[PDB]
Amino acid sequence: MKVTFEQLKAAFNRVLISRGVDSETADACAEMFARTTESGVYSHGVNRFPRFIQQLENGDIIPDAQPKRITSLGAIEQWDAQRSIGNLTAKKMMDRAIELAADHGIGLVALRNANHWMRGGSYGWQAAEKGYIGICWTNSIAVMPPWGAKECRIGTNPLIVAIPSTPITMVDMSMSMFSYGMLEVNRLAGRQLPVDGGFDDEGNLTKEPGVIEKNRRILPMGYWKGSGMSIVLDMIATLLSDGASVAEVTQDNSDEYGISQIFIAIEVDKLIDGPTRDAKLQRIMDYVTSAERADENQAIRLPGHEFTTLLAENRRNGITVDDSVWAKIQALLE
Amino acid sequence: MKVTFEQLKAAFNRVLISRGVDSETADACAEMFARTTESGVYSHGVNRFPRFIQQLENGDIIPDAQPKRITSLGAIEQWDAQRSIGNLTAKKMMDRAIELAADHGIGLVALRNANHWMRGGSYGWQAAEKGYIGICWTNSIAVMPPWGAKECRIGTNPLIVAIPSTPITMVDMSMSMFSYGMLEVNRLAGRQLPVDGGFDDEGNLTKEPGVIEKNRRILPMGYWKGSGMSIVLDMIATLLSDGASVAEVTQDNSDEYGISQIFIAIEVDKLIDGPTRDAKLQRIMDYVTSAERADENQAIRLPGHEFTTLLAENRRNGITVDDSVWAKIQALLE
Ligand SMILES: NC(=O)c1ccc[n+]([C@@H]2O[C@H](COP(=O)([O-])OP(=O)(O)OC[C@H]3O[C@@H](n4cnc5c(N)ncnc54)[C@H](O)[C@@H]3O)[C@@H](O)[C@H]2O)c1
Numbered sequence: 080m081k082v083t084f085e086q087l088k089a090a091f092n093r094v095l096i097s098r099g100v101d102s103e104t105a106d107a108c109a110e111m112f113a114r115t116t117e118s119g120v121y122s123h124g125v126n127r128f129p130r131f132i133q134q135l136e137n138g139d140i141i142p143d144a145q146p147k148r149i150t151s152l153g154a155i156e157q158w159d160a161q162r163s164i165g166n167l168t169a170k171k172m173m174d175r176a177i178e179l180a181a182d183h184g185i186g187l188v189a190l191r192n193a194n195h196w197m198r199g200g201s202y203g204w205q206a207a208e209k210g211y212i213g214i215c216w217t218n219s220i221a222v223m224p225p226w227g228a229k230e231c232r233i234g235t236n237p238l239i240v241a242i243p244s245t246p247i248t249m250v251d252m253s254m255s256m257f258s259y260g261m262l263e264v265n266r267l268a269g270r271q272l273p274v275d276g277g278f279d280d281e282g283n284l285t286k287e288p289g290v291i292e293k294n295r296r297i298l299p300m301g302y303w304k305g306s307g308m309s310i311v312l313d314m315i316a317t318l319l320s321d322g323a324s325v326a327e328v329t330q331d332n333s334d335e336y337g338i339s340q341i342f343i344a345i346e347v348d349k350l351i352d353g354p355t356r357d358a359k360l361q362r363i364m365d366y367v368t369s370a371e372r373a374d375e376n377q378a379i380r381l382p383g384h385e386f387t388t389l390l391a392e393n394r395r396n397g398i399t400v401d402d403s404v405w406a407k408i409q410a411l412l413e
Numbered sequence: 414m415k416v417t418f419e420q421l422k423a424a425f426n427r428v429l430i431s432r433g434v435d436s437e438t439a440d441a442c443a444e445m446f447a448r449t450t451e452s453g454v455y456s457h458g459v460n461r462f463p464r465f466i467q468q469l470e471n472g473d474i475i476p477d478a479q480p481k482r483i484t485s486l487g488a489i490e491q492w493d494a495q496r497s498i499g500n501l502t503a504k505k506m507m508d509r510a511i512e513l514a515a516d517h518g519i520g521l522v523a524l525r526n527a528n529h530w531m532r533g534g535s536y537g538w539q540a541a542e543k544g545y546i547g548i549c550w551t552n553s554i555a556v557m558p559p560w561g562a563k564e565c566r567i568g569t570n571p572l573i574v575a576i577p578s579t580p581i582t583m584v585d586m587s588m589s590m591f592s593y594g595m596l597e598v599n600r601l602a603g604r605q606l607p608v609d610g611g612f613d614d615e616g617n618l619t620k621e622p623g624v625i626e627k628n629r630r631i632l633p634m635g636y637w638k639g640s641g642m643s644i645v646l647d648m649i650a651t652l653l654s655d656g657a658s659v660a661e662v663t664q665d666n667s668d669e670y671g672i673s674q675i676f677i678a679i680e681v682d683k684l685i686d687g688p689t690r691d692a693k694l695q696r697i698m699d700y701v702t703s704a705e706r707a708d709e710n711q712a713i714r715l716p717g718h719e720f721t722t723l724l725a726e727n728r729r730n731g732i733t734v735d736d737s738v739w740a741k742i743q744a745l746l747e
């Protein structure tokens with residue numbers, strides 16, 4: 080289903096408005112959903128709109144709610160989202176971390192009682208766009224089992240690291256090798272994962288999507304390494320925001336809400352000259368892209384670089400959304 | 414062979430002093446090399462000493478040199494190691510970060526022209542002991558090919574994240590799923606890796622150490638995830654310190670020296686109560702350890718919790734050092 084930027088935002092807008100969302104907030108929120116899609120992140124863009132709505136109706140989200148600063152230690156700041164909209168509040172918090180970084184060289188915002196921020200890379204991206212290094216992450220509900228377990232007790236806690244290079248180099252990864260969304264994609268397509276992305280009932284690694292989708296034994300990136308990183312990122316987000324951990328949000332809440340997020344912005348230009356920054360960054364990037372390829376036809380790519388090409392493509396060949404997804408959106412009307 | 418702490422530290426100090434190292438710094442360095450070894454880290458403790466001394470004699474390391482601060486923006490500072498001792502300087506720099514966080518909430522020190530810091534986890538650990546969150550990483554020579562390549566163009570750039578929990582929770586991990594050191598351990602014992610750790614000559618994943626140690630096609634942790642992470646960690650350390658990147662160090666230097674490192678400390682106690690900190694942190698660790706196991710008799714390990722028993726065991730049955738390694742150290746005094 081081929082659509083337009085305005086059409087997407089239009090839908091997102093009216094749907095929100097009819098759900099007790101003030102036009103202003105609705106528009107702002109609808110804007111981000113449309114932007115995330117046009118950038119190529121449909122999974123957390125148009126595709127996540129439906130699930131985002133139901134949670135709103137469930138009261139997990141409060142459109143009229145707004146962030147509030149609790150404590151200030153200088154370069155670091157603890158805030159309280161107060162169950163506000165995920166993407167909107169996160170975008171503001173990263174902007175805040177940038178302000179703090181502007182006068183401190185580096186800034187950090189710990190957010191508690193927050194909602195799912197959709198695409199994490201959005202916040203790292205808006206920072207890298209301003210010449211700052213961007214680093215952020217959040218915790219979530221227990222959707223993955225720690226290394227050595229068969230029960231889900233840790234979250235996907237995605238880590239984002241964006242660098243103000245040209246083009247922007249950014250890492251936006253789940254702690255789980257594959258996201259449950261990619262599993263469905265492969266399952267529906269009838270293909271298996273390129274690499275082991277889970278465990279079957281016998282406890283053996285597998286590439287079979289369906290098996291993992293059922294037992295929830297999704298494989299952590301780097302096995303024990305991803306598992307470990309997930310836990311430490313949960314502790315840091317929990318501690319600095321004095322908020323809810325993966326355990327708390329899972330065992331105490333009715334769904335995935337009230338999570339904890341971290342936002343970091345780091346000054347760059349006041350530490351390294353423009354010409355030097357470009358030369359040093361360029362040498363790194365070319366050192367990677369000029370390496371002897373494993374597959375000559377397949378060129379080596381840098382992290383996040385696709386978000387620049389994908390965007391350009393949609394702004395030319397138009398945006399295309401999954402029929403089953405679009406059809407669902409239309410349903411939300413009337 | 415068994416050796417007492419002081420007997421071990423004496424062998425280090427003796428060699429250090431015989432290599433022109435200052436009496437005070439010598440004792441300081443030997444101390445770290447000993448403590449690291451007593452913590453159960455031999456690969457980067459006593460077994461790396463010979464290599465250390467070799468780079469020292471080659472001029473790579475300047476025992477005299479001391480860290481020189483360059484620029485200060487507030488909570489972030491850029492320092493120049495000036496080819497000083499790796500572990501001794503890294504310790505001071507993390508102490509400077511802890512010093513900055515104490516008054517700004519969060520501190521970061523970007524260091525250029527540094528030397529191998531031995532055990533990265535040492536610094537994250539030292540921060541956590543002070544009650545601060547410890548995060549640090551360094552770059553290295555290109556010893557691993559970026560995802561999609563067969564030629565080494567990226568470094569192992571280890572990321573350390575330590576939490577002031579009880580016990581201290583910490584992830585000290587390289588960006589390579591396995592370290593070349595571990596590949597040798599298995600190969601020598603005719604053992605296959607527990608999980609894929611590299612590619613063969615035909616570009617296929619393999620658990621065969623030998624072939625990997627030969628083509629240097631070591632596998633990045635989490636495939637493209639680790640490869641991407643290594644690249645962004647290198648960019649950050651290079652930019653904030655305006656220092657050498659993996660590419661620069663590998664081609665502009667005669668050996669592994671003049672690398673870039675990042676040291677970060679974040680205060681916790683001023684954002685959360687001691688009891689609330691112990692409770693929330695315990696609820697996280699318990700949520701992990703109480704997970705249904707894949708093997709009923711195999712406990713779920715939390716990252717870094719093995720360093721408490723390794724230390725205790727060594728501080729009761731004496732330290733066990735490889736005999737050939739001990740003789741190689743002694744031989745340096747010949
Ligand atoms: N709870 C949450 O908030 C949550 C949880 C899981 C995932 N997510 C989001 O879902 C999205 C996808 O996450 P993912 O982990 O599946 O991402 P992914 O594996 O597709 O990519 C992770 C990173 O690796 C890079 N990459 C991918 N293929 C590459 C290749 N062939 N060569 C070089 N680099 C490559 C990408 O640019 C990216 O930065 C992200 O936006 C993530 O934030 C959110």
Ligand SMILES: NC(=O)c1ccc[n+]([C@@H]2O[C@H](COP(=O)([O-])OP(=O)(O)OC[C@H]3O[C@@H](n4cnc5c(N)ncnc54)[C@H](O)[C@@H]3O)[C@@H](O)[C@H]2O)c1
Binds near residue numbers: 531571583716719
């Ligand atoms: N350039 C450098 O200076 C450099 C380069 C490479 C490695 N190193 C060092 O070598 C050492 C080893 O690194 P590595 O990546 O090979 O480590 P590793 O894979 O052995 O461990 C990484 C992490 O996973 C955890 N872990 C291991 N097994 C686990 C299990 N079964 N369950 C749960 N958690 C588990 C550990 O506690 C640790 O925090 C580190 O001290 C690292 O800093 C340094």
